[PDB]
Amino acid sequence: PEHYIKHPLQNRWALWFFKNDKSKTWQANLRLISKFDTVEDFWALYNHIQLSSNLMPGCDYSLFKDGIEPMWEDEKNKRGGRWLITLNKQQRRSDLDRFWLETLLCLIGESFDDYSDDVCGAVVNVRAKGDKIAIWTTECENRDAVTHIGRVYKERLGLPPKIVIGYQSHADTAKNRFVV
């Protein structure tokens, strides 16, 4: 049986695309690409779409649990925030694609133990001024979950223990609340 059943993921995920177009509101520029809920369907999707390093400036990918839209206003994001990774123009080449794929795997692989239920999704922003990768969690005031996700994420990315990453509430974005 191991040879013919697809491997179900713990959650169903939706991948979203954003393309800046000044003709439209921010929300109208956000589009759902597809959903998947197995390992096989994840890789089929990933192998079919552009690497984030090849996207035009002003585009985003977002991967969110099915039923959570990748915007502050969603009920599961309004009281949350994000662990923010900032990349300069030389880490678009060096780390953007490898960090984003590691982020995707931390999500679909439920890599944060009990607190993976606090994860809502992740976003990569490709920009001329510098790219960003972030994991969104549901409750900025849950310090245990937020700190533990931040520590695991930093190790899974392989960031040196001298670098500091920060967690910002979405209420502020719309400064750091935690640092690891």
Side-chain angles (χ1 to χ4, degrees), residues 87-88 90-101:
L87 313 163
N88 56 39
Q90 302 81 38
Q91 325 166 66
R92 178 177 296 166
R93 147 165 193 284
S94 286
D95 314 303
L96 176 68
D97 295 331
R98 66 187 189 85
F99 283 181
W100 180 239
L101 172 64

Side-chain angles (χ1 to χ4, degrees), residues 1 4-26 28-30 32-74 77-78 80-88 90-128 130-142 144-154 156-161:
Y4 68 95
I5 287 76
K6 301 197 260 177
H7 298 75
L9 304 173
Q10 181 93 34
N11 289 110
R12 178 185 282 127
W13 299 89
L15 180 78
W16 296 77
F17 182 77
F18 174 96
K19 187 168 164 44
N20 203 18
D21 169 1
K22 296 182 174 186
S23 289
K24 306 196 257 196
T25 66
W26 182 89
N29 281 321
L30 182 59
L32 165 79
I33 295 186
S34 71
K35 313 197 198 185
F36 60 87
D37 65 354
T38 68
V39 172
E40 290 78 6
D41 294 316
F42 162 76
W43 286 114
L45 173 61
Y46 177 85
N47 286 324
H48 171 76
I49 65 183
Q50 301 285 351
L51 292 173
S52 311
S53 63
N54 208 48
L55 292 179
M56 294 205 327
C59 297
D60 320 324
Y61 284 128
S62 308
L63 191 76
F64 273 70
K65 281 168 185 185
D66 187 23
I68 307 183
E69 308 192 321
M71 56 188 68
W72 305 326
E73 299 93 324
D74 186 288
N77 298 322
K78 32 182 198 167
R82 63 180 181 175
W83 279 110
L84 178 57
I85 302 307
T86 59
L87 313 163
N88 56 39
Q90 302 81 38
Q91 325 166 66
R92 178 177 296 166
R93 147 165 193 284
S94 286
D95 314 303
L96 176 68
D97 295 331
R98 66 187 189 85
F99 283 181
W100 180 239
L101 172 64
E102 200 62 40
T103 304
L104 295 172
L105 295 169
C106 284
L107 267 49
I108 72 184
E110 311 293 331
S111 303
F112 302 112
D113 311 283
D114 317 65
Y115 301 136
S116 270
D117 287 355
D118 279 46
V119 173
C120 307
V123 177
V124 55
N125 311 286
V126 181
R127 299 298 184 265
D131 310 313
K132 299 211 261 282
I133 303 167
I135 287 178
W136 292 26
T137 79
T138 195
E139 180 53 83
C140 64
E141 301 275 341
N142 184 345
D144 284 10
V146 164
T147 310
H148 174 272
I149 292 170
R151 290 209 254 275
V152 176
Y153 192 29
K154 185 174 171 184
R156 284 282 302 266
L157 291 175
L159 303 186

